[PDB]
Amino acid sequence: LSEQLKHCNGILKELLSKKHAAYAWPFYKPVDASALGLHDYHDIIKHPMDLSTVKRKMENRDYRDAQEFAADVRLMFSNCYKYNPPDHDVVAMARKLQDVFEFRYAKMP
Ligand SMILES: Cc1ccc2ncccc2c1-c1cc(-c2c(C)noc2C)cc2[nH]c(C3CC3)nc12
Protein backbone atom coordinates (compact mmCIF):
# COMPACT_ATOMS: atom_id res chain seq x y z
CA LEU A 1 0.00 0.00 0.00
CA SER A 2 3.04 2.26 0.17
CA GLU A 3 3.27 1.38 -3.53
CA GLN A 4 -0.41 2.20 -4.06
CA LEU A 5 0.04 5.53 -2.29
CA LYS A 6 2.97 6.30 -4.62
CA HIS A 7 0.67 5.64 -7.57
CA CYS A 8 -1.85 8.01 -6.00
CA ASN A 9 0.86 10.63 -5.56
CA GLY A 10 1.77 10.20 -9.22
CA ILE A 11 -1.84 10.80 -10.22
CA LEU A 12 -1.98 13.88 -8.00
CA LYS A 13 1.18 15.27 -9.58
CA GLU A 14 -0.35 14.67 -13.00
CA LEU A 15 -3.60 16.43 -12.06
CA LEU A 16 -1.53 19.44 -10.95
CA SER A 17 0.78 19.39 -14.00
CA LYS A 18 0.85 21.79 -16.94
CA LYS A 19 -0.54 19.01 -19.16
CA HIS A 20 -4.01 19.43 -17.61
CA ALA A 21 -3.87 23.06 -16.48
CA ALA A 22 -6.42 24.30 -19.03
CA TYR A 23 -9.18 22.44 -17.15
CA ALA A 24 -7.62 21.62 -13.75
CA TRP A 25 -7.10 25.19 -12.57
CA PRO A 26 -10.50 25.69 -10.82
CA PHE A 27 -9.56 22.74 -8.57
CA TYR A 28 -6.11 23.97 -7.52
CA LYS A 29 -7.26 25.86 -4.41
CA PRO A 30 -10.29 25.76 -2.09
CA VAL A 31 -13.38 27.46 -3.46
CA ASP A 32 -13.29 30.98 -2.02
CA ALA A 33 -17.05 31.34 -1.83
CA SER A 34 -17.11 34.95 -0.62
CA ALA A 35 -14.58 36.10 -3.21
CA LEU A 36 -16.54 34.42 -6.01
CA GLY A 37 -19.89 35.76 -4.80
CA LEU A 38 -21.17 32.24 -4.09
CA HIS A 39 -22.77 33.06 -0.78
CA ASP A 40 -24.75 29.81 -0.61
CA TYR A 41 -21.74 27.56 -1.29
CA HIS A 42 -21.15 26.45 2.29
CA ASP A 43 -24.86 25.88 2.86
CA ILE A 44 -24.85 23.39 -0.02
CA ILE A 45 -21.37 21.84 0.25
CA LYS A 46 -20.76 20.25 3.66
CA HIS A 47 -17.22 18.98 2.98
CA PRO A 48 -15.18 21.20 0.63
CA MET A 49 -12.22 19.60 -1.11
CA ASP A 50 -9.60 20.69 -3.64
CA LEU A 51 -6.25 19.55 -4.98
CA SER A 52 -4.12 21.68 -2.65
CA THR A 53 -5.84 20.00 0.30
CA VAL A 54 -5.31 16.56 -1.24
CA LYS A 55 -1.65 17.48 -1.72
CA ARG A 56 -1.25 18.64 1.88
CA LYS A 57 -2.91 15.45 3.14
CA MET A 58 -0.62 13.29 0.98
CA GLU A 59 2.47 15.20 2.11
CA ASN A 60 1.42 14.84 5.76
CA ARG A 61 0.79 11.07 5.37
CA ASP A 62 -2.87 11.66 6.24
CA TYR A 63 -4.09 9.13 3.66
CA ARG A 64 -3.55 5.61 4.90
CA ASP A 65 -4.57 3.88 1.67
CA ALA A 66 -5.48 4.55 -1.95
CA GLN A 67 -9.21 4.30 -1.27
CA GLU A 68 -9.07 7.18 1.21
CA PHE A 69 -7.20 9.33 -1.32
CA ALA A 70 -9.66 8.47 -4.10
CA ALA A 71 -12.63 9.32 -1.88
CA ASP A 72 -11.28 12.86 -1.42
CA VAL A 73 -10.59 13.35 -5.14
CA ARG A 74 -14.08 12.12 -5.96
CA LEU A 75 -15.57 14.31 -3.21
CA MET A 76 -13.97 17.31 -4.93
CA PHE A 77 -15.67 16.42 -8.21
CA SER A 78 -18.99 15.56 -6.53
CA ASN A 79 -19.08 18.96 -4.83
CA CYS A 80 -18.68 20.57 -8.25
CA TYR A 81 -21.49 18.45 -9.71
CA LYS A 82 -23.69 19.22 -6.69
CA TYR A 83 -23.29 22.99 -6.59
CA ASN A 84 -23.20 24.01 -10.24
CA PRO A 85 -25.74 23.65 -13.04
CA PRO A 86 -24.69 20.78 -15.32
CA ASP A 87 -24.08 23.15 -18.26
CA HIS A 88 -21.59 25.34 -16.35
CA ASP A 89 -18.08 25.53 -17.82
CA VAL A 90 -16.61 24.41 -14.50
CA VAL A 91 -18.61 21.17 -14.73
CA ALA A 92 -17.22 20.44 -18.19
CA MET A 93 -13.75 20.96 -16.74
CA ALA A 94 -14.54 18.69 -13.79
CA ARG A 95 -15.71 15.92 -16.11
CA LYS A 96 -12.49 16.10 -18.12
CA LEU A 97 -10.23 16.12 -15.05
CA GLN A 98 -12.23 13.28 -13.52
CA ASP A 99 -11.71 11.26 -16.70
CA VAL A 100 -7.96 11.78 -16.29
CA PHE A 101 -8.24 10.70 -12.67
CA GLU A 102 -10.45 7.64 -13.12
CA PHE A 103 -8.52 6.15 -16.03
CA ARG A 104 -5.19 6.43 -14.23
CA TYR A 105 -6.60 5.36 -10.85
CA ALA A 106 -7.84 2.23 -12.61
CA LYS A 107 -4.19 1.41 -13.47
CA MET A 108 -3.37 1.11 -9.75
CA PRO A 109 -0.82 -1.69 -9.13
C1 LIG B 1 -17.19 31.11 -10.26
C2 LIG B 1 -16.77 30.67 -11.65
C3 LIG B 1 -17.32 31.31 -12.76
C4 LIG B 1 -16.96 30.94 -14.05
C5 LIG B 1 -16.05 29.91 -14.29
N6 LIG B 1 -15.75 29.59 -15.56
C7 LIG B 1 -14.87 28.60 -15.79
C8 LIG B 1 -14.25 27.88 -14.79
C9 LIG B 1 -14.56 28.21 -13.48
C10 LIG B 1 -15.48 29.25 -13.18
C11 LIG B 1 -15.84 29.63 -11.86
C12 LIG B 1 -15.24 28.91 -10.75
C13 LIG B 1 -15.83 27.78 -10.18
C14 LIG B 1 -15.25 27.10 -9.11
C15 LIG B 1 -15.91 25.93 -8.57
C16 LIG B 1 -15.45 24.59 -8.45
C17 LIG B 1 -14.14 24.02 -8.82
N18 LIG B 1 -16.39 23.80 -7.92
O19 LIG B 1 -17.47 24.62 -7.68
C20 LIG B 1 -17.19 25.89 -8.08
C21 LIG B 1 -18.26 26.91 -7.89
C22 LIG B 1 -14.02 27.55 -8.58
C23 LIG B 1 -13.41 28.67 -9.14
N24 LIG B 1 -12.24 29.29 -8.80
C25 LIG B 1 -12.14 30.30 -9.63
C26 LIG B 1 -10.98 31.26 -9.62
C27 LIG B 1 -9.61 30.70 -9.36
C28 LIG B 1 -10.28 31.55 -8.32
N29 LIG B 1 -13.18 30.38 -10.50
C30 LIG B 1 -14.02 29.33 -10.20
What's 88's domain CATH number? Answer: 1.20.920.10
Phi (first) and psi of residue 106, to 5 degrees: -65, -20
Spatial separation of the C-alpha atoms in residues 63 and 70, rounded to whole Å: 10
Task: Provide the domain count of the chain.
Answer: 1
Supply the residue whose CA is at minimum distance from atom 1 of ligand 1. 36
Mention every residue, 6+ apart, whose C-beta is less than 8 A from residue 11: 73, 101, 104, 105
Ligand 1 atom closest to residue 25's alpha carbon, by position in its atom list:
27
Ligand 1 atom closest to residue 27's alpha carbon, by position in its atom list:
17
Spatial separation of the C-alpha atoms in residues 40 and 54, rounded to whole Å: 24
Ligand 1 atom closest to residue 36's alpha carbon, by position in its atom list:
1
Taking CB atoms within 8 Å and a gap of at least 24, the contacts of 46-54 are 47/75, 47/79, 48/79, 49/73, 49/75, 49/76, 49/79, 50/76, 51/12, 51/15, 51/16, 51/24, 51/27, 51/76, 52/28, 54/12
Mention every residue, 6+ apart, whose C-beta is less than 8 A from residue 73: 11, 15, 49, 54, 101, 105
Note down the domain range covering 80: 1-109
CB 33: neighbour CB atoms within 10 A?
Answer: 17
Supply the residue whose CA is at minimum distance from atom 23 of ligand 1. 26
